[model samples]
Target chain A: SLSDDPMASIKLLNLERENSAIAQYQSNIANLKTTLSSQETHLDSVSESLKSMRDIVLWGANGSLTDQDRSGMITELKSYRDSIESSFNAQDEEGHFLFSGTKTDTAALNKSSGAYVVEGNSDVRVVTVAKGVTMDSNMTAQEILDIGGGKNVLNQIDALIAEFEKPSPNFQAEVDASLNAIDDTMANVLGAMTEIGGRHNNLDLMDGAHSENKLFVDKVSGDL
Target chain B: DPMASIKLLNLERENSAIAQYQSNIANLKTTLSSQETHLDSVSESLKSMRDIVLWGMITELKSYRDSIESSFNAQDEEGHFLFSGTKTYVVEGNSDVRVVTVAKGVTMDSNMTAQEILDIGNVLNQIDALIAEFEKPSPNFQAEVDASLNAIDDTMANVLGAMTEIGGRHNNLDLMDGAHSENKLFVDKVSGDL
Candidate 1:
């Protein structure tokens, strides 16, 4: 009975192939979603840390604060900076560093000559979401941390801490510069989140289309 | 000429439509969740403002105020303004509510307007007044700081309320998504039996 209808058999085979492709696409999307979710978690942590650093820098601007007060603030600022550095160096479950651009195997940030520098390039790691459509699944450290003309957020923090360490620091001016840098870094982080959200919405739409097409293929195969 | 096959095809079409509806709901949920993230960021920025004000760090306070305003006017990746409600392209002063269908004959408001949540215009006004007082030699500097603190408290409360509303909607979405999933399973079983 099966061999009596070669046309039907061929149609069913085509439907089966279509279903296989859909399954593979869905699997790939799931993997990409996991990576994005991990990135979001790390970004949230970094955001909160930046807020704390901002608060400390603001407090340090107070002329009433003594050397002892500034010293304590320096310790806390370094702690937040270290925490943010760890987040920048975060890796996904596949052992690929999320912020390393195309250098997924390498860490994104490293301290050289007592200043933090970006070790990662600016190339994005893109994942296939459809037949020809691809989306960037990771952000580069340079894109996020590098402010401009050779400045990065981590070293900016160090610079602020050093200013506090100065015997006669220009407290107001230094605090103003540091706060500007922090705000810039926060903008970069939020920009990354916005892109992630956009990709997520696109993926949701693609997933819906795939699910619908899969069901249609099933129905067609059954009819054949 | 079996009638059963034709009937099955019609049922499949119905099932396909249901799948489409679910897809729409999924997309809506994603957008809502993203908006929720932005709102959380706004709340965090305001809390930092409170601290900066208390420290009497006028420069830092001004920077934080700019940061808050930027967040309120931030756009999505597609260039759609996140907090402007339905008028996504408008940069400021748009507070129209956005609604979308989540189910058959069901809809939900999908945005938290800038006016509704933060009344950012009023907040900025208060902050500017406080900053002006701090800049000049004013006898009422302490009084101005106290007034700014009170305003910050009210804004934070408003933001928290918006967040709570989003949380409730997310829960509702989960319930609807579960119902759809169960319905899909039933349809699949029936299709298999046929």
Candidate 2:
């Protein structure tokens, strides 16, 4: 009956200026942080995938496809990349990263030739929940993209994409070999996928912790 | 006319069918029997875990209450019950996670059994909370109190640990598995590992 009161809310006995809602929100932020981190990670992953694809093309050109056959393979690689760009660009324009981050509403990547121009912020916003618990929920666009740094795979993908799209046929033989190159690139991408999958598993753990924290705050707050 | 000679063969065929039926029943019974044994073992392990936790809580709580009362009744040098013994158990340097420190003295006892100690630990979450609570007090008289609490929790942890080990052992034994293999066996495929 005492619990029936509308004004009855769970406030911390030791911590001032915070309630269970704050704690719950803070936990949610923790979960969101994981998601945001994931999007950035995957963005980097996609960049790496692109770089491997580049190596695949380069090696294939040198060893497998002739200059004459390179053009056709380049055309195919560009087509596959083009489809990814088409869907991704709209997300970029409207802030939808098919897998960008918590703020997937914003495009995490920008594709022009092959460089991913990142366009977002990385500051995590926090809400005071319990006395000591804090939550960080948002991430920036750069964290989501695999670009800028030379080692970033996006640059490698750019080199390949540009090479593929080139009107000149000087590298036509490489284009044919590009098929073998991109195939190897995909295999390389698989290893990255395994790493990302592990991170995703960690996210599941973090999410579970957040949820349980919320439940705990709810129960403990009731004691108030 | 041919029926007279065929009768002997017919008798032999009947005998073979009876033998096959007996063998099938025996196989089914053996399988079912092993399953029942496994089920019993699983139940024992579960109960063991439950009992240890329950007993540990009752024993510890009573001990704490009595000590508090005794200290207040006598008003010793530092508000401690005279009967309280110096104690300790530090678990590593936080990161190292080694249970390095142990009891320097004794605290009040609840005359608890191994099973009871586990019960108390499970109910009060002694291993986690006691270690956490003790970490705060300095390594002085208060540290002794902290050590006392840690000792009880450590003992309880051992019992819980035993239950865990036994549960694992008998789970594969198949003797106690009983009627339900789908939940345990099927989930083993995807439940434990990625």
Q: Best candidate, TM-score-wise? A: 1
Q: What is each model's TM-score for chain A? A: 0.95, 0.45
Per-residue CA lDDT of candidate 1, range A32-151, in tens? 888888899999899999999999887778767587678889889999999999999998767888898888888889886678878888886667554433556777777888668568
lDDT of 1 at B124: 71
What are the lDDT scores of the predictions, listed in order?
0.77, 0.40
Provide the TM-score of chain B versus the true chain B for each model in turn: 0.89, 0.30
For each candidate, report its DockQ versus the true two-chain complex: 0.01, 0.01
What digit string (tens of lDDT, one per residue) describes model 1 on residues B1-194?
37768767856876886688688778877877887787777777779888888764667877777777887888877798878867781237466767564544335567777877766346777888888987895888888888788888888888887887677567556655665677678878877777
What residue pairs clash in candidate 1, if any at all?
A: none
For candidate 1, the share of real interface contacts preserved is 0.00
Best by lDDT: 1
